[PDB]
Design a protein around this nucleic acid. Structure first.
Ligand SMILES: [Mg+2]
Length: 438
DNA sequence: GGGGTGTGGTAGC
DNA sequence: ATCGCTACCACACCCC
């Protein structure tokens, strides 16, 4: 056990935090793409008619945690057993669940206690540990297979287990759904072989958003082909409102109230006006949804296809620790902040940049929230506070940055014993050139 | 027209 | 027990 005031707390928390792994893997995938392609030209022109194949593993962690499970779990059955991947027993997040578990209405993000109660008696939840290193290797095999197929002109990494693959269709070639079925089946078979038993599903379409929706419809272990020319009431009636990219619980709730609680995108599609959309959720998001309900991508989402190198270039660097934060005094907070900056400055040296603006964010116990929340070591119910600060000369100097961060903490006025979470950000990054003379 | 800030939402498992 | 990260866009409100 390593507590927030121990020197090794940052290292142990990140080794254990799957959310860190997700983010660290994404970042490495993004930088890897930029490296492979520094000399190649990674763009899709407006000259190109293209097909989008949106690929991702079916219940990634659960699948892989099963396939590499320890001897204690040799007899458990991925097709009959409700399986979750989690650290703990009570208020531990279900990082991933197989589709047997979902049949009982369980979803990721749910706590293990909550999911235990949606099972009939006698049916027992299986809880698998995380296998991070195997998660990596299976992902490597995933992207290695996608490249070896030589059927894609651009392979965009979305996630450790998710990629958007772009096929350019010359106008001499007449695309057909038969040929698209055969590609999906090739891809699915080849990743099944290359990953020793992991299955992917594929959405296939002539827009990013319809490929995202097709993919939801393809799950589990299948594929779906739906171009703009194939749209139908049957299609839209199949999706919830928060199946739309950009629509999370907050946008959902706003949409639900403005539009008489639509229960499908088909419901949404018939009742909506562009301006009532914009009014309900916002101008840019409203437009994105409007375009989306026609099967069309917006200008912001098309950028990744036109200039992936710019969209995938890292613009900020940060850490976030909102679990395990329990400090008795201001000295321990300052030393933790210093470990934080030291960590971020290593990462910042790796990418050979300086930073010219930094931010500190914190979570403070709500005045009426219990000192110890339901989730062990959780941040609990919190107000957030943020404050940023421009540096004069861009820099990678620990002395300047750690001093300013501690100053920022101090302007925020949060007693060490009320602290429940900390973020440390480098907001603007500046390249280091061969010229360094003033 | 151009800056700026802090805040809030969303995405992957 | 339990590991509630992190990048990025958008917005609302401020300034000369
Ligand atoms: Mg959604």
């Amino acid at each position: 056990i390593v507590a927030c005031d121990d020197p090794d707390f940052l290292t142990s928390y990140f080794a254990h935090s799957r959310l860190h792994h997700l983010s660290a893997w994404k970042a490495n995938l993004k930088d890897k793409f930029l490296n492979e392609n520094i000399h190649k030209y990674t763009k899709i022109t407006d000259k190109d008619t293209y097909i989008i194949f949106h690929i991702d593993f079916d219940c990634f962690f659960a699948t892989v945690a099963y396939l590499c499970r320890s001897s204690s779990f040799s007899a458990c059955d991925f097709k009959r057993d409700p399986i979750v991947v989690c650290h703990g027993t009570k208020n531990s997040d279900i990082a991933s669940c197989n589709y047997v578990a979902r049949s009982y209405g369980i979803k990721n993000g749910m706590w293990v206690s909550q999911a235990e109660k949606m099972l009939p008696n006698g049916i027992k939840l299986i809880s698998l540990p995380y296998t991070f290193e195997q998660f990596q290797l299976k992902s490597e095999a995933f992207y290695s297979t996608l490249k070896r197929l030589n059927i894609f002109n651009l392979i965009l990494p979305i996630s450790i287990d998710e990629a958007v693959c772009v096929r350019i269709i010359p106008d001499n070639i007449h695309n057909t759904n038969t040929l698209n079925a055969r590609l999906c089946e090739e891809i699915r078979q080849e990743i099944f072989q290359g990953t020793n038993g992991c299955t992917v599903s594929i959405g296939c379409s002539d827009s990013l958003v319809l490929a995202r929706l097709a993919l939801k419809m393809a799950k589990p272990n299948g594929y779906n082909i739906t171009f703009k020319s194939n749209l139908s009431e049957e299609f839209w009636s199949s999706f919830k409102l928060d199946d739309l990219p950009g629509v999370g619980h907050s946008t959902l709730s706003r949409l639900e109230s403005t539009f008489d609680s639509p229960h499908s995108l088909n419901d949404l599609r018939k009742r909506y006006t562009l301006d009532a959309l914009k009014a309900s959720v916002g101008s840019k998001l409203g437009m994105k949804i409007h375009l989306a309900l026609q099967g069309q991508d917006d200008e912001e989402s098309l950028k990744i296809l036109y200039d992936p190198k710019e969209v995938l270039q890292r613009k900020s660097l940060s850490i976030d620790i909102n679990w395990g934060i329990r400090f008795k005094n201001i000295t321990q907070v300052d030393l933790f902040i210093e470990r934080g900056c030291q960590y971020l400055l290593e990462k910042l040296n790796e990418i050979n940049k300086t930073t010219s603006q930094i931010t500190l964010k914190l979570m403070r116990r709500c005045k009426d929230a219990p000192i110890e929340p339901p989730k062990y070591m959780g941040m609990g119910r919190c107000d957030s506070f943020s404050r940023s600060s421009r540096l004069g000369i861009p820099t990678n100097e620990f002395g300047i940055i750690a001093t300013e961060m501690k100053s920022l903490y101090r302007t925020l006025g949060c007693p060490p014993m009320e602290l429940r979470g900390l973020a440390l950000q480098f907001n603007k990054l500046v390249d280091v050139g061969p010229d360094n003379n003033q």
